[PDB]
Amino acid sequence: GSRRASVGSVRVRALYDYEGQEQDELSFKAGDELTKMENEDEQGWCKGRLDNGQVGLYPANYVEPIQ
C-alpha cells in the first residue's frame, strides 16, 4: 500500500492564475501545484493546501488533476 491509494489528498495543477479574497482563501499562478482536501461544492469551488503551506478555498474550475 501507498499514499496514492488514499482519498484525503489529491494533487492538482492550476489551469490559470487566481488571488484569494478572504483569510480562508489561496493564491497561485498558471502552472502551479496545489493539494485538494475537499470535494467540489454546488458553486464549483474546493478547499485545499498551497505550495507555500496555507489552507483555504479556491475555484475548482481553475485546476486539473495530476496523475
Curated annotation (Swiss-Prot):
Transmembrane stretches, start-end: none
Domain SH3 per the UniProt entry, residue ranges: 10-67
Subcellular location: Cytoplasm; Cytoplasm, Cytoskeleton; Cytoplasmic vesicle membrane; Cell projection, Ruffle membrane
Tissue: Detected in intestine, cardiac muscle, lung and brain (at protein level). Expressed in all tissues tested, including, gizzard, liver, cardiac muscle, skeletal muscle and skin.
PTM comment: Phosphorylated on serine residues.
Similarity annotation: Belongs to the PACSIN family.
Domain description: The F-BAR domain forms a coiled coil and mediates membrane-binding and membrane tubulation. Autoinhibition of these functions is mediated by an interaction between the SH3 and F-BAR domains. The F-Bar domain also mediates the binding to the cell actin cytoskeleton through the interaction with CAV-1.
Protein task: Regulates the morphogenesis and endocytosis of caveolae. Lipid-binding protein that is able to promote the tubulation of the phosphatidic acid-containing membranes it preferentially binds. Plays a role in intracellular vesicle-mediated transport. Involved in the endocytosis of cell-surface receptors like the EGF receptor, contributing to its internalization in the absence of EGF stimulus. Essential for endothelial organization in sprouting angiogenesis, modulates CDH5-based junctions.
Protein name: Protein kinase C and casein kinase substrate in neurons protein 2
Species, as recorded: Gallus gallus (Chicken)
Gene expressing this chain: PACSIN2
Parent-record interval covered: 391 to 448 of 448
